[PDB]
Amino acid sequence: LHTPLGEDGDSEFGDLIEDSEAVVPADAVSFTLLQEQLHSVLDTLSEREAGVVSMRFGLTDGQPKTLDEIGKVYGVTRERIRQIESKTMSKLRHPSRSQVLRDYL
DNA sequence: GGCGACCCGGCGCCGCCTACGGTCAGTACTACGGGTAGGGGGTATCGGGCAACGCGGCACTGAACACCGTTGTCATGTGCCTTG
Known part of the structure; x- marks a missing residue:
């Protein structure tokens, strides 16, 4: 050099x-x-939906948690957690809470 | 003998920013040996799709009583007629 x-x-x-x-x-x-x-936008949704999506995708810690992994601290079932995750993805898929996130990709 | 030259070493510097720049360098060898990170299969453990089983408003079997409303009922009281 x-x-x-x-x-x-x-x-x-x-x-x-x-x-x-x-x-x-x-x-x-x-x-x-x-x-x-x-x-x-996450706070805009319900606080419970907010929390479960945050723990599933790991928005407070680097590593995400599995579905049943969330059903220990929150004391819910591996299929309940999946259902609320699915309807969260449905809502966030709504064009309302998508535009502000479109340009970010 | 300390000075003195001189001689040399020895360093140390020689001013500030800006555009682009073109490339390549010669004389061992085998042989073993271990030991592996990579190629494979099979197994234990965790992670998804349908129903699960709650609740709540209200709603009905209306049932069984309650609340007035009503014409049942009546033994017991006025008014006229007959006899004291």
């Missing part, structure tokens, strides 16, 4: 290649706005 870069002075091949680990502020703030808007 300390090669002359073909230039006798003031240059180094080590100062011409961009990295990839660096966080792009644009993408980061877009993600933050996505998180806030999704949390807002």
Whole structure:
């Protein structure tokens, strides 16, 4: 990386290649706005529906939880949880609570 | 003998940002040996689709009583007629 870069002075091949680990502020703030808007639309729905979808898709922890995995803290059945998840997906699929999330993809 | 030159070392610098830049370098070899990460099959455990079994309003078997309403009922009282 300390090669002359073909230039006798003031240059180094080590100062011409961009990295990839660096966080792009644009993408980061877009993600933050996505998180806030999704949390807002999530609060718009019922608090119970909100909580169950959040725990299923893991919106507070990195790893999502399985259906029956939610039926221990909340004390519900593996098929009840599936049913409320299904009707949550049905409601969120409504064009009402989709537009604000369309551009986010 | 400390000065003195001189001699050398030795470093250290030589100004600020800007556009593009083109490429390639020669003389071992086999042989074994272990040991694996990858190729396979079969098994134990967790994760989905239909009914599940609650509830609640009210609603009915109306049943069985209750609330007035009513013409049943009547032993017991006025008015006229006959006899004291």
